[PDB]
């Protein structure tokens, strides 16, 4: 697993260890697993899927950003 | 009628020629040997088209309002602009002469191509069954004779502008030191640039000629080879398709003319 | 005489090459068009219309050679 | 071949081709020309009210 | 079919028509358009002169 | 005899080149379709639609070719 | 005998060319299916079902040519 | 005998190759055109102007050979 | 007689074309496989699974061709 | 006669080849020009100037092959 | 007798085409391999491992054909 | 007789293939040149210098073949 | 005698294909290599290393071919 | 004797294939070289060094083919 930070300029919205996430990146829906090679991209508004280690899923709503 | 389509299709490719020496009609079965045998049909139709163009434009030029244009004036000033902008965006010398030339090219070639839309037998049928003539084809641009003529005209216009705007000295320098920039290879450049020079009219003519010749030939083949009653389902598509060709083959002639001359001067 | 079969063979050659050219060129163009469609799913009508404007040109020479092939097959032989 | 019948086959297609031209090629021309008359009318009317 | 004399005749008809267009069609109509463009654009001169 | 032999070589070149052309063209188009699909798992059916549209164009010439190949190998044979 | 030896050459091309067709035409296609997979592992099942759909079309004509390749090679001999 | 069929084969060569080259080059160019269009859906007319500008030079040399092919097929044969 | 070497030519034809098809088709595919791997170096097994799932397909017609080549080359 | 009829295959090949090599080479180059234009649409007529400059170098071999391709058919034959 | 000629010719062809296949296949694969490496050299040996595990397959039909070709050129003489 | 015709064919093939080679090579090279220029127009002349520098190496082996094609026709004849 | 002719032809085609294969194979790889270098100096020696590692494989079958070509033309002939 | 013209043809096609291979390989390589330049121009000397290093590898087999073809055209023929 890997370590995920979801932060806004105002506040922090998530941290901790995760197994995967699925993110509607600018140039096409995307999904990150551990070890993923270095990447950078904008993202569109809408939900993001987090599955926390031990498989506990949760959603978050993002208005945009950069991954 | 004792016709196999297997040779009626051949008669349709025959030209109603003259001989300047005889001043009479060259029969299809034997062709006379000379350079001096006008395609009567081409000169007759070609100008019957181009005069129609010139008339239909002059009749409006003699009246054109600076007010609200007539529904028919509208189309003509529309396409006047359609050509004018295409001139303006690409040619950047002074010469007045380019734009009228391009307008003539575009409209006249458009009409020449448009000739072939009509059913293949209809005018030959008239020329034989009623008007007692031996043979007739009615598309000028289905002949190298019209197209190499126009193209060589544009070649002379190159020879006009290239000197007029950069003189014989620069003309030859380009023709001697491009592309390699080194005097050490001039004779090679002399070959390359000259056959490049002639590629322009050669391709210009043969493009239009081949496209229209084949667009005709498909109509001929469809007419003859098939059972007449099945011919609609294969004559409709090709007619539909030929709209785009008759249009673009003329537009592209115009465009490349402008580009070649503008490259000459600049 | 055997003059016939060479003509049929020449027409085979010509149609094979024409089909190769048509299929490949149109495939490239259509693939780029589908990419554009994936990006701009709302513009697919304008793009789909623009596509034909050139798709008619890619299959020009193929449509010459097809006719000549048929001419050599059936008319000449 | 019945040559007259082949001139029949010409006519079907050519009446059929006209029926495509009338419904798919002519209306784009009479719509754009009307758009042009629209623009010229507007660009004159507004400008001359600005003259007022 | 083959190279003819017809090429020269077509060259003559071609240049004839090019002149017959050059002089008596092209300026005649571009003058019309651009005169309309003068009278349309100069209507703005009111909102740029009297307004001032 | 060979009037009845070389026609198989003619059919062979016809259908072989037709196969190559169709396969390559549709492969390219389908590749771009699958990539668009991965990027847009919602538009899958719409892209599929446009794909079935232009795919029909890509195969138009190849099918002429295989029809002619059949004609040759069984009509003149 | 003068007759049948030649026909193996005709078979060689139909069944040979068809290989290059269905080979590359599918290799390209699968390559995008992998790219799509590497981005979105969670769709690796869904994309495959699209892969098998189109992949039928690409190798349709090759299957024609190998089909006939048998008819010529073995049956007509 | 040799007077006739070899010329038909020569024309078949000419025009098959012409078809390949024209279709493929035009396809590449049109593909780039449509891609750019999908990236700048405003500039359709500017882009397609430049498209027609260069696209003639693509067909410039292939139609040399297609014309000369119609010569050999009908100026001789 | 004139048969034998001609049929060996006919076999060589199919073998060469099968080799071309197989080599190019598998290269064009393995390239994307390696770039996917370098993208997600932790899913290599799943991608290798799919890579074989389709490699088996590309080699179908080429293997048919190599088989018939051997057949001709030795069964006659 | 054969010593004369066989040359039409020579010219057929010689320029038939130079066509596609030229048309594709041009197509590619025209391709990159369009993508540049789409990404610097204010800079086009600068790129269009370089395009024509380099585009001349493409035609060097193709044209002289058309030269020899023409000399053969009419002078040699 | 004449049998030697066509057998040396067949060897040349059957190994030339295999050569082209293996060459271009491995070149294509290696391009991606080097690019992946250069993006992140930390992974070079893992990519090299999976690269050879692939490269083994690209070489299959090429070396099979080289076996049959050497057999021909020497054993069948 | 035809002894002095196979040589014309050998010239044609050599020069045609040289045409394909030089055309495609320079097409690709010029394409990358144009895009490099488009991204960094400040560098156009340096880029063009390197462009000619590399083009030199491209044209050499194609050029040697064209000269030999000349020689075959006019020197050895 | 006639054996010489076809021996030379066989070696000729063999090595022509060998040249095609090896030149393109290394060209692709080198292109990706130079892209890497431009991305990432300070890796260049390691890139050169692994480049040569795979390079050695591309030349394998081509080197077989260029060996056997000499075997034909000078060991046999 | 029929001897020399077949060797002329063989050498012609051999060095024609050499021309294609070398030209296109160097074209690809130079294109990636140029874009690497436009990305990091100050590395132009190092990229030039590595480009020449690799270019030396590509032209190897092609120039061997050149040697053999010119030999057979001037040392046999």
UniProtKB/TrEMBL annotation, chain A:
Quaternary organization: F-type ATPases have 2 components, CF(1) - the catalytic core - and CF(0) - the membrane proton channel. CF(1) has five subunits: alpha(3), beta(3), gamma(1), delta(1), epsilon(1). CF(0) has three main subunits: a, b and c.
Family stated for the protein in its record: Belongs to the ATPase epsilon chain family.
Protein name (database record): ATP synthase epsilon chain
Function (record text): Produces ATP from ADP in the presence of a proton gradient across the membrane.
Lineage: Bacteria, Pseudomonadati, Pseudomonadota, Gammaproteobacteria, Enterobacterales
Domain ATP synthase F1 complex delta/epsilon subunit N-terminal: 3-67
Species of the source: Escherichia coli O145:NM
Subcellular location: Cell membrane
TrEMBL record, chain B:
Pfam families from the UniProt entry: ATP-synt_A (PF00119)
Keywords: ATP synthesis, Cell membrane, CF(0), Hydrogen ion transport, Hydrolase, Ion transport, Membrane, Transmembrane, Transmembrane helix, Transport
Domain of life: Bacteria
Cell location: Cell membrane; Membrane
A GO cellular component annotation in the UniProt record: proton-transporting ATP synthase complex
Predominant cellular place of this UniProt entry's protein: membrane
SUPFAM superfamilies, A to Z: F1F0 ATP synthase subunit A
GO terms of molecular function: hydrolase activity; proton-transporting ATP synthase activity, rotational mechanism
Keyword Membrane: yes
GO biological process: proton motive force-driven plasma membrane ATP synthesis
Bilayer topology term: Multi-pass membrane protein
InterPro entries per UniProt: ATP_syn_F0_a_bact/chloroplast, ATP_synth_F0_asu, ATP_synth_F0_asu_AS, F0_ATP_A_sf
TM ranges: 33-57, 97-115, 144-163, 208-230, 236-261
Family to which the UniProt record says this protein belongs: Belongs to the ATPase A chain family.
Function: Key component of the proton channel; it plays a direct role in the translocation of protons across the membrane.
Name of the protein in its database record: ATP synthase subunit a
Organismal lineage: Bacteria, Pseudomonadati, Pseudomonadota, Gammaproteobacteria, Enterobacterales
Gene: atpB
């Amino acid at each position: 697993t890997y370590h995920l930070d979801v932060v806004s300029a105002e506040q922090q919205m998530f941290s901790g260890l995760v197994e995967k996430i699925q993110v509607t990146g600018s140039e096409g829906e995307l999904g990150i697993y551990p070890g993923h090679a270095p990447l950078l991209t904008a993202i569109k508004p809408g939900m993001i899927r987090i599955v926390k280690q031990h498989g506990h899923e949760e959603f978050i709503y993002l208005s945009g950003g950069i991954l | 009628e004792n016709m196999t389509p297997q040779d009626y299709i051949g008669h349709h490719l025959n030209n109603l020629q003259l001989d300047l020496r005889t001043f009479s009609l060259v029969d299809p079965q034997n062709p006379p040997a000379t350079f001096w045998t006008i395609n009567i049909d081409s000169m007759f139709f070609s100008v019957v088209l181009g005069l129609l163009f010139l008339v239909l434009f002059r009749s409006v030029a003699k009246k054109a309002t600076s007010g609200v244009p007539g529904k028919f004036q509208t189309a003509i000033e529309l396409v006047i602009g359609f050509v004018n902008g295409s001139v303006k965006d690409m040619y950047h010398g002074k010469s007045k002469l380019i734009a009228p030339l391009a307008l003539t090219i575009f409209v006249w070639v458009f009409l020449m191509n448009l000739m072939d839309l009509l059913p293949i037998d209809l005018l030959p049928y008239i020329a034989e069954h009623v008007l007692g003539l031996p043979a007739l084809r009615v598309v000028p641009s289905a002949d190298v004779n019209v197209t190499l003529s126009m193209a060589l005209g544009v070649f002379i216009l190159i020879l006009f502008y290239s000197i007029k705007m950069k003189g014989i000295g620069g003309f030859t320098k380009e023709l001697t030191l491009q592309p390699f920039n080194h005097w050490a290879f001039i004779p090679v450049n002399l070959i390359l640039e000259g056959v490049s020079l002639l590629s322009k009219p050669v391709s210009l003519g043969l493009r239009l000629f081949g496209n229209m010749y084949a667009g005709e030939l498909i109509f001929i083949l469809i007419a003859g080879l098939l059972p007449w009653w099945s011919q609609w389902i294969l004559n409709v598509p090709w007619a539909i398709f030929h709209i785009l060709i008759i249009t673009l083959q003329a537009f592209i002639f115009m465009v490349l003319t402008i580009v070649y001359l503008s490259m000459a001067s600049e | 005489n055997l003059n016939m079969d060479l003509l049929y063979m020449a027409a085979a050659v010509m149609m094979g090459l024409a089909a190769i050219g048509a299929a490949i060129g149109i495939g490239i163009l259509g693939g780029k068009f589908l990419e554009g469609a994936a990006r701009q799913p709302d513009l697919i009508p304008l793009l789909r219309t623009q596509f034909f404007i050139v798709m008619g040109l890619v299959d020009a020479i193929p449509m010459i050679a097809v006719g000549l092939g048929l001419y050599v097959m059936f008319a000449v032989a | 071949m019945n040559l007259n019948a082949t001139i029949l086959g010409q006519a079907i297609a050519f009446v059929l081709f006209v029926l495509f031209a009338m419904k798919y090629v002519w209306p784009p021309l009479m719509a754009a020309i009307e758009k042009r008359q629209k623009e010229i009318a507007d660009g004159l009317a507004s400008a001359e009210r600005a003259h007022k």
